[PDB]
Design a protein around this nucleic acid. Structure first.
Lengths: 175, 58, 36, 142, 207
RNA sequence: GAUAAGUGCUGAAAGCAUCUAAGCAUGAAGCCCCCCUCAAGAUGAGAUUUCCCAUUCCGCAAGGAAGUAAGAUCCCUGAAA
RNA sequence: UGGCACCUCGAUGUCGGCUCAUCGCAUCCUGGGGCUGUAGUCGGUCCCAAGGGUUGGGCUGUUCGCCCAUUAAAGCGGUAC
């Protein structure tokens, strides 16, 4: 009933290398995922299943415990397997092909929308309406999906624009 | 006078206030500040009084 | 939208302290309030 | 009968490293050294201090939220000309005058104060071009 | 970038291929000789000096003749720098002519305007008169000098004084024709300065 | 380039949630640059290139006098001033 | 706007025009946003924003006001009218 001390299994079959306190190099088959973890915290990478150690205090070290452990778990899982995000294109013929690694949108704007993808990330286009972004880092995938949806957000008077693979959009009715 | 005594005493590992308390507490040295400064500007006699006070400060 | 008397109205309303300022957020759009 | 001094003064060169020290918690002992309060031959009208050189001025630090709180105003003489810049850009772009302003603020006013300020030296980076004077290290009391 | 300098002759007209009249100004140019080169390590920045319109021997002293010894030319009357150029393709003693400019290029021109002497408020700053009838005794004079509270006059009040004769720049001027045989340039428009002055002709840097 | 009101990403304290407490973004005719002009009396008086040579007398001493070199000015003809 | 009364001096000349202006933001226009009882076109209301801009005449009255014709707009206030 508290994640900060509640550890979970860490096979860490990847080449998890623990450098000095305020840095960890979690490398594996997918790639190299490195990040400094809170230095003030007592990092405990022991055997295979590692953990953190809340030293003292009430309102900050508990938060550090939870955040650092969640970051470590997400990094470990990412360096072994990735995660994707779905975005829909329901609307009036808003097409989306894939010109090379880059993609072009065909929404109501007179000029076409060009989006250069950041490196390391992957985009797949099964259909012009379905865009799937894949990667090994949750933050980057979320940021790219946020940008894509911010290109043309939906509206409350009709179903158009970019969605989130079934996002709950609240619809209004009016004259 | 007080400023010069303070500098010389700090050279020895003390403060002006502690040195004055120790001097008045030990053997009642009734030397004023003027002759203390003369003994500062011509020291190695100033230091002897400083260890005299350090002895009684404990 | 501002209402310097911040106070829950909806049954799902929650009180948050973003950036040292009292906030309320509800799923109904007509409920956001900032202390100030 | 007390001995004043004139043309019998002797100066020295001291190097002070400002890596983790607080801004105003070393610029006061530096000012005291500049004025000359640490010599038994101190005299109030003669400027019996000595030179100091400060290196690594880029590593000084503040506390709290002062990196965005403190503001420096330099109104010119024209109407409406009140300029300002925050402490963060002051440190990233003008560290030398950032330290010099504080040191000058804690010094007396008049011709003697201006000479005492003249005997200061502030540098960025780690090296100084004064090896001919053969300076020596000084460890501040803190 | 690029540029040379010369004198200015006068004004005239030119009928274009569309039978359209356009005013014109004439620049004398003549070959320019590079005299020195400045480097980042030696000087702190990159530039080239230029020389133009040599003068006779009696009008130059010994340091001047020593300076132009390396470029191997006669002493010159005008010298000025020009920053931002490609530091290669330039040697000391090399010649630079009018061909560096093409017919349709855009240019900025810099000079010094004519002097006007001691001028008054109405002409110097374009202020207004007072009425000239109805029992008025206020015609061509500066206005009030501010409020009462400050006990002083602000910095920035506008008063008569010596007017003109400073440095001005006019940008975005086209070139009409290039006449290499006489070393001529034909700009379109007006240009600051009196006749027989020194005019800098540099390629446009946007605006 | 950094931001205001805003919109956000992953994320705990609080097994959920959450724009934030770690961290990472976007965002104005405001702000700092980009454009034009003045600017080393900036007593902190800055830099590069080229010329002239280390004369003669008094004074043990610091110094004090006299002709000069490179270079200027007085004086005269004028205005693009 | 009153109440009350501290520097009244060979006085505490109070209001409108002319010539020159400067500052505040509690924003008239222009820039960026949240809600709507916002299908769009046009709106309403609330935040962030002080860089620039913000009109010619008739009527008698010096004042206050009423009108004619424009414009993106014809903003409130302090500086001894």
């Amino acid at each position: 009933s508290r994640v900060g001390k509640k550890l979970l299994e860490i096979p860490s079959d990847v080449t998890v290398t623990l450098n000095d306190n305020n840095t960890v190099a979690v490398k594996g088959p997918k790639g190299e995922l490195t990040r400094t973890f809170h230095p003030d915290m007592e990092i405990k990478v022991e055997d295979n299943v590692l953990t953190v150690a809340r030293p003292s205090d009430q309102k900050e070290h508990r938060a550090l415990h939870g955040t650092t452990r969640s970051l470590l778990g997400n990094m470990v899982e990412g360096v072994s397997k990735g995660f994707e995000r779905g975005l829909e294109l329901v609307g009036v013929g808003y097409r989306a092909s894939k010109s090379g690694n880059k993609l072009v949108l065909n929404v109501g704007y007179s000029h076409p929308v060009e989006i250069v993808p950041e490196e390391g990330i992957e985009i797949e286009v099964p259909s012009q309406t379905k865009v799937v972004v894949k990667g090994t880092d949750k933050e980057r995938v979320g940021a790219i999906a946020a940008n894509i949806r911010a290109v043309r957000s939906p509206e409350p008077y009709k179903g158009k624009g970019i969605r989130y693979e079934g996002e709950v959009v609240r619809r209004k009715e009016g004259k | 006078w007080i400023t010069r005594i303070n500098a010389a005493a700090r050279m020895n590992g003390l403060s002006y206030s502690r040195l004055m308390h120790g001097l008045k507490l030990s053997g009642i040295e009734v030397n004023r500040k003027m002759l203390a400064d003369l003994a500062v500007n011509d020291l190695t006699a100033f230091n002897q009084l400083a260890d005299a006070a350090k002895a009684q400060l404990n | 939208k501002v209402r310097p008397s911040v106070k829950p109205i909806c049954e799902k309303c929650k009180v948050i302290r973003r950036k040292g300022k009292v906030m309320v957020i509800c799923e109904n759009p007509k409920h956001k309030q900032k202390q100030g | 009968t007390p001995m004043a001094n004139a043309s019998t003064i002797e100066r020295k060169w001291l190097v002070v490293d400002a890596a983790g020290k607080t801004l105003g918690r070393l610029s006061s002992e530096v000012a005291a050294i500049l004025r000359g309060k640490h010599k038994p031959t101190y005299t109030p009208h003669v400027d019996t201090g000595d030179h100091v050189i400060i290196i690594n001025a880029e590593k000084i630090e503040l506390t709290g939220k002062k990196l965005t709180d403190k503001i420096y105003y330099r109104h010119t003489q024209h109407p409406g000309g009140l300029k300002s810049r925050t402490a963060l850009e002051m440190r990233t772009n003008y560290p030398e005058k950032m330290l010099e302003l504080a040191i000058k603020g804690m010094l007396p006013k008049g011709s003697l104060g201006r000479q005492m300020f003249k005997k200061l030296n502030v540098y960025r980076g780690s090296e100084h071009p004064h090896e001919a004077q053969k300076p020596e290290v000084y460890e501040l009391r803190g | 970038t690029k540029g040379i300098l010369g004198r200015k002759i006068g004004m005239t007209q030119v009928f274009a291929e569309n039978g359209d009249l356009i005013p014109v100004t004439v620049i004398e140019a003549a070959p320019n000789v590079v005299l020195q080169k400045k480097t980042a390590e030696n000087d702190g920045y990159e530039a080239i000096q230029l020389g133009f319109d040599d003068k006779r021997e009696k009008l130059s002293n010994k340091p001047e003749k020593g300076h132009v010894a390396k470029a191997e030319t006669a002493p010159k009357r005008f010298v000025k720098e020009l920053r931002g150029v490609e530091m290669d393709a330039y040697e000391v003693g090399q010649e630079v002519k009018v061909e560096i400019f093409s017919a349709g290029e855009i240019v900025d021109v810099t000079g010094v305007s004519k002097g006007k002497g001691f001028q008054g408020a109405i002409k110097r700053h374009g202020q207004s008169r007072g009425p000239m009838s109805h029992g008025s005794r206020y015609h061509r004079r500066p206005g009030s000098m501010g409020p009462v509270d400050p006990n002083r006059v602000f910095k920035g009040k506008l008063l008569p004084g010596r007017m003109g004769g400073e440095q001005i720049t006019v940008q975005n001027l086209e070139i009409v024709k290039v006449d290499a045989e006489r070393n001529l340039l034909l700009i379109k428009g007006n240009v600051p300065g009196a006749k027989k002055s020194l005019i800098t002709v540099k390629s446009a840097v946007k605006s």
